[PDB]
């Protein structure tokens, strides 16, 4: 919770430079928010009602609070294919982050169920073809029936 | 255009400018900086939320179902309570309405500060 | 049959990580069963033959099924 | 290809109208309790209502969950017509009692018993948590008895 890269994948080492944060390397979005585990002392907001986000995760059964939770990770296919290959399960319910200028970041007080929402990733290259920093990212929606 | 009592409307709004993500289904009248405005001559629903059809459609559609009024007889068997007057609802699916028998529908829509589009309908028997 | 058929369930740690179940049904419908002589008319001590097929009465793939006959 | 079920709170309400009065069966979707019957859901607490459990999905690649439930004679809005029989209700809460309240959340009128009577409507409401556009719904289904 203490480093600007929770709930993203790379090392919990961070500095911050004009291009983002040095240790984020793949974010997931849900209407361009990332998607975050409620942790740390700035997740007490309760929202409308007198339930916290991560209590109502928890009596929804959610137990995919974040990405840390589902243990998505990112594996190679092969020993020098250079092709990593990561999963998860979209989870029913999330919680919406606030706000992300501030660390650890500061949860909703309520959650909102993740159909029709776009989920979008977005990986961070250190050097493109160039060889410099190009931020690239694929876009999906959550359907429903 | 004309619709009876305790009867369900299907409002829809074709709206290219709010389709403001491709992958996201877009909403309307959630917010106070964008209202959607349901009325009849004496009752109202304040942020009524609409729905996109599609993800990428630009079409808007939702419903509200006019409840009516309580204070009448309709069945003629000698008490009140046959239309369940109430109005309340704020998504795009569950609005319910009080209109009395001789009212008339009004639904505004905002695009942009100090412009609205409305639309309008009436009630009879 | 149908939603009632005999369903066996089974839980998994799938290869992203959640506890999804998997599970198969078959059903097991029962037989309407037919009981016939082997000729149509038979003299005395013509060795009559009961022929019953209904593959609901067995019980058992290994053991050979039989019935008595109640004596009381 | 496994088990489903629909674990949604009180998503499914089976009720029985006449005209103007209506009367509700129970609900459907959360843990099966034991409860009385409502008329025109006039009792504001849900834990009072009979629940008939969670909806057992008919094929594990199917997605169409079936439930069944039996309707008593008895499980009727109150009418005048059906004075004729000094009904005894069976009980549907803990209790072994014949009376009135042992099924119903209050009692019948006085000279009217809950009864069905010929022409009836059935009817089935299910609240979708989630649909195309991945918000509340409802949808009807009717029948006539």
């Given at each position: 919770n203490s480093k600007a890269t929770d709930d993203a994948v790379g090392s919990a080492t961070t500095q911050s430079l004009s291009f983002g944060e040095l240790g984020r390397l793949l974010d997931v979005t849900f209407d361009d928010v990332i998607w975050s585990t409620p942790d740390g002392a700035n997740n007490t907001a309760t929202g409308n009602d007198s339930d916290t986000c991560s209590t109502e995760l928890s009596n929804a059964g959610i137990t995919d609070t974040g990405l840390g939770a589902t243990g998505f990770t990112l594996v190679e296919t092969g020993a020098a294919t250079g092709v990593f290959v990561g999963d998860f399960q979209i989870p029913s319910f999330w919680c919406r982050v606030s706000d992300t200028t501030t660390t650890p970041y500061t949860y909703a007080g309520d959650e909102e169920t993740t159909t029709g929402l776009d989920i979008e990733v977005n990986y961070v290259d250190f050097r493109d073809a160039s060889g410099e920093i190009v931020e690239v990212g694929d876009s999906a929606g959550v359907r429903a029936n | 255009k004309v619709y009876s009592w305790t009867d369900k409307v299907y409002i829809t709004i074709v709206a290219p400018d709010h389709n403001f993500d491709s992958d996201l289904v877009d909403e309307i009248g959630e917010t106070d900086s964008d209202p959607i405005k349901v009325s009849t001559r004496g009752f109202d629903l304040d942020n009524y939320k609409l729905v996109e059809t599609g993800t990428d459609t630009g079409i808007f559609t939702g419903e509200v179902i006019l409840t009516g009024f309580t204070a009448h007889d309709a069945d003629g068997d000698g008490n009140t309570g046959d239309a369940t007057g109430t109005t309340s609802g704020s998504g795009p699916t569950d609005g319910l309405l009080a209109t009395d028998d001789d009212d008339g529908l009004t639904v505004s829509f905002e695009f942009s500060e100090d412009e609205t589009i409305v639309g309008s309908a009436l009630i009879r028997w | 049959t149908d939603e009632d058929a005999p369903r066996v369930n089974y839980n998994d740690l799938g290869a992203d990580g959640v506890t999804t179940p998997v599970s198969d049904q078959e059903e097991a419908p029962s037989h309407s069963g037919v009981v016939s002589l082997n000729a149509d008319s038979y003299k005395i001590a013509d060795t009559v033959v009961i022929t019953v097929e209904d593959l609901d009465l067995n019980v058992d793939s290994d053991l050979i099924d039989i019935f008595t006959v109640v004596s009381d | 290809a496994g088990e489903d079920a629909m674990d949604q709170d009180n998503a499914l309400k089976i009720s029985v109208i006449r005209g103007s009065d209506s009367v509700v069966l129970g609900y459907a979707g959360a843990s099966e309790r034991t409860g009385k019957i409502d008329v025109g859901g006039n009792n504001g607490t849900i834990s009072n209502i009979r629940s008939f459990g969670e909806m057992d999905e008919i094929a594990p690649d199917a997605g169409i969950f079936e439930l069944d439930v039996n309707i008593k004679f008895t499980d009727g809005p109150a009418s005048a017509?059906?004075?004729?029989h000094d009904t005894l209700y069976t009980a549907?809460?803990?209790?072994?009692?014949?009376?009135?309240t042992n099924r119903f959340d209050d009692g019948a009128a006085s000279g009217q018993e809950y009864c069905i009577l010929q022409g009836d409507i059935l009817q089935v409401e299910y609240t979708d948590p989630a649909d195309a556009s991945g918000d509340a719904n409802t949808v009807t289904d009717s029948a006539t008895f």
């Open positions: - | - | - | 017509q059906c004075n004729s549907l809460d803990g209790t072994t009692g014949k009376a009135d």
